[PDB]
Amino acid sequence: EEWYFGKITRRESERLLLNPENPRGTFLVRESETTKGAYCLSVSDFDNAKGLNVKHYKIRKLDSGGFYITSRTQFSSLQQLVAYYSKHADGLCHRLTNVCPT
């Protein structure tokens, strides 16, 4: 749905995400530019060394089966992946909050 930005670049996704109006955990999903066949979760975060920043998480997919950031926490679809990380961070920088406007 709405959060799937497709073939958007890393840099453009960082420019969209970095808007100060975006709360922590504003996100998108896109393709990986560098890993082909893979996806990325791009997430806004904040620390006080750097302020506003973005984290990117590689999404992989085992061949005949699950989508994953870490290999024991798998999901059958990208939908399930994102719906999970919106309930809990589970190791992520932040829980997923806002879909990115863009």
Footprint on this chain of ligand UR2 (rule: CB under 6 A): 10, 32-35, 40, 55-58, 69-70, 91-92
Distance, CA of 98 to CA of 34 (rounded, Å)? 26
Identity of the residue, 22 or 92, whose beta carbon is nearer to ligand UR2 in the bound complex: 92
Neighbouring residues of 3: CB distance < 8 A, sequence distance ≥ 6: 27, 28, 29, 82, 99, 100
Kindly state the tokens that stand for 78: 């990208």
Nearest distance from residue 45's CB to ligand UR2, in Å? 10
**Minimal CB distance to ligand UR2: which residue?**
91
Nearest distance from residue 64's CB to ligand UR2, in Å? 21
Identity of the residue, 21 or 72, whose beta carbon is nearer to ligand UR2 in the bound complex: 72
Identity of the residue, 11 or 21, whose beta carbon is nearer to ligand UR2 in the bound complex: 11
